[PDB]
Short mmCIF file of all heavy atoms in Angstrom, two decimals:
data_model
loop_
_atom_site.label_atom_id
_atom_site.label_comp_id
_atom_site.label_asym_id
_atom_site.label_seq_id
_atom_site.Cartn_x
_atom_site.Cartn_y
_atom_site.Cartn_z
N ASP A 678 10.49 -76.80 -73.56
CA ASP A 678 10.97 -77.65 -72.50
C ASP A 678 11.57 -78.94 -73.07
O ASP A 678 11.26 -79.32 -74.20
CB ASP A 678 9.82 -78.00 -71.55
CG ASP A 678 10.31 -78.51 -70.22
OD1 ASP A 678 10.66 -77.68 -69.33
OD2 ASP A 678 10.39 -79.75 -70.03
N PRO A 679 12.52 -79.59 -72.36
CA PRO A 679 12.93 -80.92 -72.79
C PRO A 679 11.85 -81.96 -72.73
O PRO A 679 11.78 -82.86 -73.57
CB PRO A 679 14.10 -81.23 -71.85
CG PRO A 679 14.65 -79.90 -71.52
CD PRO A 679 13.48 -78.98 -71.43
N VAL A 680 10.96 -81.89 -71.71
CA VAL A 680 9.94 -82.91 -71.54
C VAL A 680 8.72 -82.56 -72.41
O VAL A 680 8.36 -81.39 -72.56
CB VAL A 680 9.57 -83.03 -70.06
CG1 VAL A 680 8.59 -84.17 -69.80
CG2 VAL A 680 10.84 -83.21 -69.22
N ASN A 681 8.11 -83.59 -73.01
CA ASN A 681 7.14 -83.38 -74.08
C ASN A 681 5.78 -82.89 -73.60
O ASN A 681 5.21 -81.98 -74.19
CB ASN A 681 6.99 -84.67 -74.90
CG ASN A 681 6.65 -85.87 -74.03
OD1 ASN A 681 6.52 -85.77 -72.81
ND2 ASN A 681 6.50 -87.03 -74.67
N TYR A 682 5.24 -83.48 -72.52
CA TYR A 682 3.86 -83.18 -72.17
C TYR A 682 3.69 -81.84 -71.47
O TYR A 682 2.60 -81.28 -71.49
CB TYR A 682 3.26 -84.30 -71.32
CG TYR A 682 3.88 -84.52 -69.97
CD1 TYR A 682 3.34 -83.91 -68.83
CD2 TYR A 682 4.96 -85.37 -69.81
CE1 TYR A 682 3.91 -84.12 -67.58
CE2 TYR A 682 5.52 -85.58 -68.57
CZ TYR A 682 4.99 -84.95 -67.46
OH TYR A 682 5.55 -85.16 -66.21
N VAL A 683 4.75 -81.32 -70.86
CA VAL A 683 4.66 -79.98 -70.30
C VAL A 683 4.70 -78.94 -71.43
O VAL A 683 4.11 -77.84 -71.29
CB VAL A 683 5.76 -79.78 -69.23
CG1 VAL A 683 7.12 -79.93 -69.85
CG2 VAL A 683 5.62 -78.45 -68.50
N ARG A 684 5.31 -79.27 -72.56
CA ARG A 684 5.18 -78.43 -73.76
C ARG A 684 3.74 -78.48 -74.30
O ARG A 684 3.24 -77.48 -74.82
CB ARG A 684 6.17 -78.83 -74.83
CG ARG A 684 7.64 -78.63 -74.51
CD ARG A 684 8.48 -78.75 -75.76
NE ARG A 684 8.30 -80.03 -76.44
CZ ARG A 684 9.05 -81.11 -76.21
NH1 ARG A 684 10.03 -81.06 -75.31
NH2 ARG A 684 8.82 -82.24 -76.86
N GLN A 685 3.12 -79.65 -74.20
CA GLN A 685 1.76 -79.85 -74.68
C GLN A 685 0.76 -78.97 -73.91
O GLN A 685 -0.08 -78.31 -74.51
CB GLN A 685 1.37 -81.31 -74.52
CG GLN A 685 -0.05 -81.65 -74.91
CD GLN A 685 -0.40 -83.07 -74.57
OE1 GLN A 685 0.39 -83.80 -74.02
NE2 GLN A 685 -1.62 -83.47 -74.88
N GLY A 686 0.87 -78.96 -72.57
CA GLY A 686 0.00 -78.12 -71.78
C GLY A 686 0.32 -76.64 -71.94
O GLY A 686 -0.55 -75.79 -71.72
N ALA A 687 1.58 -76.32 -72.29
CA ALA A 687 1.91 -74.95 -72.61
C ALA A 687 1.24 -74.49 -73.90
O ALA A 687 0.85 -73.33 -74.02
CB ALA A 687 3.43 -74.78 -72.69
N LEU A 688 1.11 -75.41 -74.87
CA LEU A 688 0.45 -75.06 -76.12
C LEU A 688 -1.05 -74.88 -75.92
O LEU A 688 -1.67 -74.00 -76.54
CB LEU A 688 0.71 -76.14 -77.17
CG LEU A 688 2.13 -76.33 -77.67
CD1 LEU A 688 2.21 -77.50 -78.63
CD2 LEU A 688 2.65 -75.07 -78.34
N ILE A 689 -1.66 -75.69 -75.05
CA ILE A 689 -3.08 -75.59 -74.79
C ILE A 689 -3.40 -74.32 -74.01
O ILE A 689 -4.36 -73.61 -74.30
CB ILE A 689 -3.56 -76.86 -74.06
CG1 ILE A 689 -3.37 -78.07 -74.96
CG2 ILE A 689 -5.03 -76.73 -73.65
CD1 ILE A 689 -3.58 -79.39 -74.24
N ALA A 690 -2.57 -73.99 -73.01
CA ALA A 690 -2.78 -72.79 -72.22
C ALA A 690 -2.53 -71.52 -73.03
O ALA A 690 -3.17 -70.49 -72.80
CB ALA A 690 -1.90 -72.81 -70.98
N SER A 691 -1.58 -71.59 -73.98
CA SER A 691 -1.41 -70.48 -74.91
C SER A 691 -2.60 -70.35 -75.84
O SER A 691 -2.95 -69.24 -76.29
CB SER A 691 -0.13 -70.68 -75.71
OG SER A 691 0.03 -69.67 -76.69
N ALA A 692 -3.26 -71.47 -76.14
CA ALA A 692 -4.49 -71.41 -76.93
C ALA A 692 -5.66 -70.86 -76.12
O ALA A 692 -6.53 -70.18 -76.67
CB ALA A 692 -4.82 -72.79 -77.50
N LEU A 693 -5.67 -71.12 -74.82
CA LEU A 693 -6.80 -70.70 -73.99
C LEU A 693 -6.75 -69.19 -73.76
O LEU A 693 -7.81 -68.56 -73.60
CB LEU A 693 -6.79 -71.43 -72.65
CG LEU A 693 -7.15 -72.91 -72.65
CD1 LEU A 693 -6.95 -73.48 -71.25
CD2 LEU A 693 -8.57 -73.13 -73.11
N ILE A 694 -5.56 -68.60 -73.73
CA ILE A 694 -5.45 -67.21 -73.31
C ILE A 694 -5.77 -66.23 -74.44
O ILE A 694 -6.32 -65.15 -74.19
CB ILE A 694 -4.07 -66.98 -72.68
CG1 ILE A 694 -3.94 -65.58 -72.08
CG2 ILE A 694 -2.94 -67.26 -73.66
CD1 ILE A 694 -4.97 -65.29 -71.04
N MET A 695 -5.50 -66.60 -75.69
CA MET A 695 -5.50 -65.63 -76.78
C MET A 695 -6.55 -65.95 -77.86
O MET A 695 -6.30 -65.73 -79.05
CB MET A 695 -4.13 -65.53 -77.42
CG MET A 695 -3.09 -64.89 -76.54
SD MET A 695 -1.52 -64.85 -77.39
CE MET A 695 -1.18 -66.59 -77.42
N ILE A 696 -7.70 -66.47 -77.47
CA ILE A 696 -8.78 -66.58 -78.44
C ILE A 696 -9.40 -65.20 -78.65
O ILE A 696 -9.56 -64.41 -77.73
CB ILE A 696 -9.84 -67.63 -78.00
CG1 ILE A 696 -10.42 -67.31 -76.63
CG2 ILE A 696 -9.25 -69.00 -78.02
CD1 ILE A 696 -11.59 -68.17 -76.30
N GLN A 697 -9.70 -64.94 -79.93
CA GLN A 697 -10.24 -63.66 -80.41
C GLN A 697 -9.36 -62.49 -80.00
O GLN A 697 -9.79 -61.57 -79.28
CB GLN A 697 -11.68 -63.44 -79.91
CG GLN A 697 -12.66 -64.50 -80.34
CD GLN A 697 -14.03 -64.19 -79.83
OE1 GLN A 697 -14.25 -63.19 -79.17
NE2 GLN A 697 -14.99 -65.06 -80.14
N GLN A 698 -8.10 -62.54 -80.41
CA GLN A 698 -7.15 -61.45 -80.19
C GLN A 698 -6.35 -61.29 -81.46
O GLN A 698 -5.74 -62.25 -81.95
CB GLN A 698 -6.23 -61.71 -78.99
CG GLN A 698 -6.95 -61.73 -77.65
CD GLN A 698 -5.99 -61.92 -76.48
OE1 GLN A 698 -4.77 -62.03 -76.66
NE2 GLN A 698 -6.54 -61.97 -75.26
N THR A 699 -6.37 -60.08 -82.02
CA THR A 699 -5.62 -59.83 -83.25
C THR A 699 -4.19 -59.43 -82.94
O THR A 699 -3.79 -59.28 -81.77
CB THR A 699 -6.31 -58.75 -84.08
OG1 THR A 699 -6.35 -57.52 -83.33
CG2 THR A 699 -7.73 -59.15 -84.43
N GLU A 700 -3.39 -59.28 -83.99
CA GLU A 700 -1.97 -58.97 -83.84
C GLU A 700 -1.76 -57.56 -83.31
O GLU A 700 -0.79 -57.31 -82.59
CB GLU A 700 -1.27 -59.17 -85.19
CG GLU A 700 0.25 -58.99 -85.19
CD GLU A 700 1.00 -60.05 -84.41
OE1 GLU A 700 0.47 -61.15 -84.21
OE2 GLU A 700 2.16 -59.78 -84.01
N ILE A 701 -2.69 -56.64 -83.61
CA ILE A 701 -2.57 -55.28 -83.10
C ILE A 701 -2.96 -55.22 -81.62
O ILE A 701 -2.51 -54.30 -80.91
CB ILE A 701 -3.41 -54.33 -83.97
CG1 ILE A 701 -3.05 -52.86 -83.72
CG2 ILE A 701 -4.91 -54.54 -83.77
CD1 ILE A 701 -3.60 -51.90 -84.76
N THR A 702 -3.73 -56.19 -81.11
CA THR A 702 -4.07 -56.20 -79.70
C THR A 702 -2.90 -56.68 -78.86
O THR A 702 -2.61 -56.08 -77.81
CB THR A 702 -5.30 -57.08 -79.48
OG1 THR A 702 -5.05 -58.41 -79.95
CG2 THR A 702 -6.52 -56.50 -80.17
N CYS A 703 -2.23 -57.75 -79.27
CA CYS A 703 -1.00 -58.19 -78.64
C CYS A 703 -0.13 -58.82 -79.72
O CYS A 703 -0.65 -59.54 -80.58
CB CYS A 703 -1.26 -59.18 -77.49
SG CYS A 703 -2.06 -60.72 -77.94
N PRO A 704 1.18 -58.54 -79.70
CA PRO A 704 2.05 -58.95 -80.83
C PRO A 704 2.48 -60.40 -80.82
O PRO A 704 3.42 -60.74 -81.54
CB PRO A 704 3.27 -58.02 -80.66
CG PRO A 704 2.80 -56.91 -79.77
CD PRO A 704 1.85 -57.57 -78.83
N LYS A 705 1.86 -61.27 -80.04
CA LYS A 705 2.26 -62.67 -79.97
C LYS A 705 1.26 -63.63 -80.59
O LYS A 705 1.38 -64.83 -80.40
CB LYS A 705 2.50 -63.06 -78.50
CG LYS A 705 3.59 -62.27 -77.84
CD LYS A 705 4.94 -62.61 -78.46
CE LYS A 705 6.06 -61.96 -77.68
NZ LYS A 705 6.07 -60.48 -77.86
N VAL A 706 0.28 -63.12 -81.35
CA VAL A 706 -0.76 -63.98 -81.92
C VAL A 706 -0.19 -64.76 -83.09
O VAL A 706 -0.19 -65.99 -83.10
CB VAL A 706 -1.98 -63.14 -82.32
CG1 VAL A 706 -3.03 -64.04 -82.97
CG2 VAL A 706 -2.55 -62.42 -81.12
N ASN A 707 0.26 -64.05 -84.13
CA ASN A 707 0.74 -64.71 -85.35
C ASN A 707 2.07 -65.40 -85.12
O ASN A 707 2.48 -66.24 -85.95
CB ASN A 707 0.85 -63.70 -86.48
CG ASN A 707 -0.51 -63.21 -86.96
OD1 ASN A 707 -1.46 -64.00 -87.07
ND2 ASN A 707 -0.63 -61.92 -87.20
N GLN A 708 2.80 -65.05 -84.05
CA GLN A 708 4.00 -65.78 -83.66
C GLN A 708 3.67 -67.22 -83.32
O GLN A 708 4.41 -68.14 -83.65
CB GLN A 708 4.65 -65.07 -82.48
CG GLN A 708 5.16 -63.68 -82.79
CD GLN A 708 6.30 -63.69 -83.77
OE1 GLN A 708 7.19 -64.54 -83.70
NE2 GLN A 708 6.31 -62.73 -84.68
N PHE A 709 2.55 -67.42 -82.62
CA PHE A 709 2.22 -68.75 -82.13
C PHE A 709 1.34 -69.54 -83.09
O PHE A 709 1.30 -70.77 -83.02
CB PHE A 709 1.57 -68.68 -80.76
CG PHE A 709 2.48 -68.25 -79.66
CD1 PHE A 709 1.98 -67.83 -78.45
CD2 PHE A 709 3.87 -68.28 -79.82
CE1 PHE A 709 2.82 -67.43 -77.42
CE2 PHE A 709 4.71 -67.88 -78.82
CZ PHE A 709 4.19 -67.45 -77.61
N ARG A 710 0.65 -68.86 -83.99
CA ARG A 710 -0.13 -69.54 -85.04
C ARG A 710 0.79 -70.27 -86.00
O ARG A 710 0.54 -71.41 -86.38
CB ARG A 710 -1.01 -68.54 -85.79
CG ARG A 710 -2.11 -67.92 -84.95
CD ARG A 710 -2.87 -66.89 -85.76
NE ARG A 710 -3.62 -67.50 -86.85
CZ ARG A 710 -4.86 -67.96 -86.76
NH1 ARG A 710 -5.53 -67.86 -85.62
NH2 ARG A 710 -5.46 -68.50 -87.82
N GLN A 711 1.90 -69.64 -86.37
CA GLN A 711 2.91 -70.33 -87.16
C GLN A 711 3.76 -71.28 -86.32
O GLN A 711 4.36 -72.20 -86.87
CB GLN A 711 3.80 -69.32 -87.88
CG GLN A 711 4.67 -68.47 -86.96
CD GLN A 711 5.44 -67.42 -87.72
OE1 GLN A 711 5.38 -67.36 -88.95
NE2 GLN A 711 6.17 -66.59 -86.98
N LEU A 712 3.79 -71.07 -85.00
CA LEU A 712 4.46 -72.02 -84.13
C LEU A 712 3.61 -73.28 -83.97
O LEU A 712 4.12 -74.39 -83.90
CB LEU A 712 4.77 -71.38 -82.79
CG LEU A 712 5.68 -72.09 -81.77
CD1 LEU A 712 6.48 -71.03 -81.01
CD2 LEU A 712 4.91 -72.92 -80.76
N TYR A 713 2.28 -73.10 -83.86
CA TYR A 713 1.36 -74.22 -83.94
C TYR A 713 1.46 -74.92 -85.29
O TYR A 713 1.43 -76.15 -85.37
CB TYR A 713 -0.08 -73.76 -83.72
CG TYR A 713 -0.39 -73.26 -82.33
CD1 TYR A 713 -1.51 -72.45 -82.12
CD2 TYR A 713 0.40 -73.56 -81.24
CE1 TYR A 713 -1.81 -71.95 -80.87
CE2 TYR A 713 0.11 -73.09 -79.98
CZ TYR A 713 -1.00 -72.28 -79.80
OH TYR A 713 -1.31 -71.80 -78.56
N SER A 714 1.58 -74.14 -86.35
CA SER A 714 1.64 -74.70 -87.70
C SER A 714 2.98 -75.38 -87.96
O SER A 714 3.07 -76.28 -88.81
CB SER A 714 1.39 -73.61 -88.74
OG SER A 714 0.09 -73.06 -88.58
N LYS A 715 4.02 -74.95 -87.25
CA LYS A 715 5.32 -75.60 -87.39
C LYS A 715 5.31 -77.00 -86.80
O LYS A 715 5.73 -77.96 -87.44
CB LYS A 715 6.42 -74.75 -86.76
CG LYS A 715 7.80 -75.33 -86.86
CD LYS A 715 8.28 -75.28 -88.31
CE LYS A 715 9.72 -75.75 -88.44
NZ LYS A 715 10.17 -75.77 -89.86
N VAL A 716 4.81 -77.12 -85.56
CA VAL A 716 4.88 -78.39 -84.88
C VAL A 716 3.80 -79.36 -85.35
O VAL A 716 3.93 -80.58 -85.08
CB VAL A 716 4.76 -78.20 -83.34
CG1 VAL A 716 5.93 -77.37 -82.85
CG2 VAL A 716 3.45 -77.50 -83.00
N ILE A 717 2.76 -78.89 -86.04
CA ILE A 717 1.77 -79.81 -86.56
C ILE A 717 2.17 -80.32 -87.94
O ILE A 717 1.77 -81.45 -88.30
CB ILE A 717 0.37 -79.16 -86.55
CG1 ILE A 717 -0.72 -80.23 -86.66
CG2 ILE A 717 0.17 -78.14 -87.68
CD1 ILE A 717 -2.09 -79.73 -86.39
#
């Protein structure tokens, strides 16, 4: 998003949904771990 804090809540909600899920369970796990690692 252009606005910063709605991206922030999107990152937290993405963290809330996929705890204890491997890449074979859903293919978006390691996509967002490196996306978290990119923005940090």
Side-chain angles (χ1 to χ4, degrees):
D678 197 82
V680 185
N681 53 0
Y682 64 94
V683 61
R684 295 194 301 269
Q685 178 187 2
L688 294 175
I689 297 169
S691 176
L693 290 174
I694 185 59
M695 292 179 291
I696 56 170
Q697 300 181 0
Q698 293 183 1
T699 61
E700 184 68 23
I701 195 167
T702 58
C703 61
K705 298 293 187 290
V706 177
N707 291 318
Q708 296 293 321
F709 290 165
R710 294 177 66 90
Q711 66 185 357
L712 190 146
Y713 293 160
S714 298
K715 181 69 175 177
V716 298
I717 198 168

